Amino acid sequence: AGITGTWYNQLGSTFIVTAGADGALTGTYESAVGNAESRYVLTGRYDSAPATDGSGTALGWTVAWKNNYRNAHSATTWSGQYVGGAEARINTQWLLTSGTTEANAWKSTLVGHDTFTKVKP
Amino acid sequence: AGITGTWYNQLGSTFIVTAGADGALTGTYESAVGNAESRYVLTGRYDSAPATDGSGTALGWTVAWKNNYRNAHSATTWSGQYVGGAEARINTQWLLTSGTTEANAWKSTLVGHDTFTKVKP
Amino acid sequence: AGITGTWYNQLGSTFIVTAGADGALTGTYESAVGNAESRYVLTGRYDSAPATDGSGTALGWTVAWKNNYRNAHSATTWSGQYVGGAEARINTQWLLTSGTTEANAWKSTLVGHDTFTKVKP
Amino acid sequence: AGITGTWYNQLGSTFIVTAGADGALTGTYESAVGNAESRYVLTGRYDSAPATDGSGTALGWTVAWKNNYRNAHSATTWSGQYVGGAEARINTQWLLTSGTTEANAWKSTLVGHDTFTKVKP
Numbered sequence: 056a057g058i059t060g061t062w063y064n065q066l067g068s069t070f071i072v073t074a075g076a077d078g079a080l081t082g083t084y085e086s087a088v089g090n091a092e093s094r095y096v097l098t099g100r101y102d103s104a105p106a107t108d109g110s111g112t113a114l115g116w117t118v119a120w121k122n123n124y125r126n127a128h129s130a131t132t133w134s135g136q137y138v139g140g141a142e143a144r145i146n147t148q149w150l151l152t153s154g155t156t157e158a159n160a161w162k163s164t165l166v167g168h169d170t171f172t173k174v175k176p
Numbered sequence: 177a178g179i180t181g182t183w184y185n186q187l188g189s190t191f192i193v194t195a196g197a198d199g200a201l202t203g204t205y206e207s208a209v210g211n212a213e214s215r216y217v218l219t220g221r222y223d224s225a226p227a228t229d230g231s232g233t234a235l236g237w238t239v240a241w242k243n244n245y246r247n248a249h250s251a252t253t254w255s256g257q258y259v260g261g262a263e264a265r266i267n268t269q270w271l272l273t274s275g276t277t278e279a280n281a282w283k284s285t286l287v288g289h290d291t292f293t294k295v296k297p
Numbered sequence: 298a299g300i301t302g303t304w305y306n307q308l309g310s311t312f313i314v315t316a317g318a319d320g321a322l323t324g325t326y327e328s329a330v331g332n333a334e335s336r337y338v339l340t341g342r343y344d345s346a347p348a349t350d351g352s353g354t355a356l357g358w359t360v361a362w363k364n365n366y367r368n369a370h371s372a373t374t375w376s377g378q379y380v381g382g383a384e385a386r387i388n389t390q391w392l393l394t395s396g397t398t399e400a401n402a403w404k405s406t407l408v409g410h411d412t413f414t415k416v417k418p
Numbered sequence: 419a420g421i422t423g424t425w426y427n428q429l430g431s432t433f434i435v436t437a438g439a440d441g442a443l444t445g446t447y448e449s450a451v452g453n454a455e456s457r458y459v460l461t462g463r464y465d466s467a468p469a470t471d472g473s474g475t476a477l478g479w480t481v482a483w484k485n486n487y488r489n490a491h492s493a494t495t496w497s498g499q500y501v502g503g504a505e506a507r508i509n510t511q512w513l514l515t516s517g518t519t520e521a522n523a524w525k526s527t528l529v530g531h532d533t534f535t536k537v538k539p
């Protein structure tokens with residue numbers, strides 16, 4: 056609430072989240088454009104009693120890249136903070152782990168960053 | 177199932193998780209001391225239909241470090257895979273974001289790696 | 298140059314680097330944040346024969362945060378790629394490890410992302 | 419400093435390094451079977467005046483995966499600390515960036531961890 060609603064990253068993904076009063080994040084992450092085949096469940100957690108000192112609100116969530124259509128055998132977690140105000144943002148770093156054999160585990164995890172805005176690009 | 181159970185990391189943290197038929201992860205994360213003040217909710221997702229080629233099962237979860245007793249204004253995400261068989265393990269890397277001001281955002285996020293076993297370390 | 302030149306990140310740190318014919322990076326780094334004063338030595342490596350397919354040029358470098366003035370007992374590595382163009386950029390992610398006791402090792406390493414251009418924000 | 423010499427990671431790689439009086443790390447990194455084709459230049463930095471409170475020694479280094487024989491168009495940086503004493507260790511986290519097109523940049527960077535010892539695994 057501040058967090059609840061629709062967010063857009065800088066690469067074409069959208070998600071919709073509900074931030075519950077108990078610290079829950081629940082919603083849907085859509086990897087592209089608009090199609091059902093590109094929508095996935097997301098769940099996570101956030102600090103439901105953040106500071107009001109100019110600090111962001113810590114949070115994180117997961118998407119496992121399986122839906123009824125597709126399965127990439129991988130999951131992303133985003134860890135970051137919500138920054139409110141007129142130009143609100145969710146600033147994140149993420150980890151994308153694929154299921155691998157033990158021989159390939161060294162190359163199982165990508166890292167990157169995403170910034171989400173409320174304003175549809 | 178494989179995933180469902182009680183896991184421990186190398187620093188004794190206790191991760192009590194249930195893997196639901198839908199890809200859901202739910203449970204609690206706590207200290208080796210086992211006190212209520214050290215116990216926090218988690219939620220996450222896993223690949224409920226992993227590959228059949230020997231690969232692990234991708235998964236992730238989040239803990240926001242607030243409970244009824246304490247608030248660190250912080251959240252951790254773990255991204256990793258479950259590896260089944262002879263001795264089951266969950267290998268992860270994690271991101272811990274604390275709320276910061278914008279000027280301090282460059283130092284908001286720690287990274288590390290945790291390995292979980294069904295035995296204590 | 299290409300890579301050789303004076304670059305600035307989104308915080309205004311100054312990265313003065315020379316790319317040698319032998320694949321070496323050498324130069325100085327001056328930070329806009331943290332326990333840092335004046336310049337610090339850097340060294341690194343870059344791909345001196347990048348792909349010709351439109352991909353960027355992979356590179357990395359290290360700064361240990363000790364100079365003749367101050368010592369923060371820590372080191373940052375930046376891993377990334379140079380992207381040529383009308384506004385050339387070096388896009389990185391970085392790891393900042395501090396020397397810690399073993400008890401504190403779990404919190405030894407910060408992660409982030411820096412973007413460098415030849416223009417100071 | 420305790421750093422100069424040959425180090426081995428968990429997975430078959432060998433680190434030969436000299437820690438100079440100027441805070442420089444210089445050497446080679448071999449992925450190998452043990453052969454010249456598997457050997458790559460490394461350079462980095464370390465804290466040459468670490469804390470005396472029992473903390474480790476911060477360091478980092480880079481290898482670009484090009485030698486006279488091959489070129490993976492990628493570079494790894496290791497960020498970590500040397501822990502001395504009876505069973506000395508270099509504990510690291512690493513970032514491997516490949517040169518990519520901008521469309522592929524989200525999948526440019528792998529993350530992981532390596533532990534180096536004085537004796538072979």
Ligand SMILES: O=c1[nH]ccc2oc(-c3cccc(C(F)(F)F)c3)cc12
Pocket residue numbers: 064068086120127128129130131149151167169
């Ligand atoms: O918007 C994002 N931000 C950070 C990471 C990330 O990964 C994806 C993504 C979406 C669909 C499939 C897959 C893969 F790789 F096949 F598993 C990954 C989207 C996205």
Ligand SMILES: O=c1[nH]ccc2oc(-c3cccc(C(F)(F)F)c3)cc12
Pocket residue numbers: 185187189241248250251252270272288290
């Ligand atoms: O088992 C772990 N593995 C990775 C990260 C991590 O953080 C904690 C932890 C627990 C309580 C509070 C806090 C803090 F920092 F104040 F936010 C962190 C446990 C744990």
Ligand SMILES: O=c1[nH]ccc2oc(-c3cccc(C(F)(F)F)c3)cc12
Pocket residue numbers: 306308310328329330331332333334362369370371372373391393409411
């Ligand atoms: O420009 C940057 N980009 C990414 C990381 C980073 O760290 C520093 C930095 C500079 C001086 C001291 C320290 C600390 F924390 F005390 F060790 C860190 C600058 C900088």
Ligand SMILES: O=c1[nH]ccc2oc(-c3cccc(C(F)(F)F)c3)cc12
Pocket residue numbers: 427431449483490491492493494512514530532
């Ligand atoms: O020992 C290690 N520890 C962490 C990372 C890492 O990457 C390599 C490595 C070696 C040769 C080629 C390549 C690639 F992928 F083609 F660029 C990577 C070795 C190594």
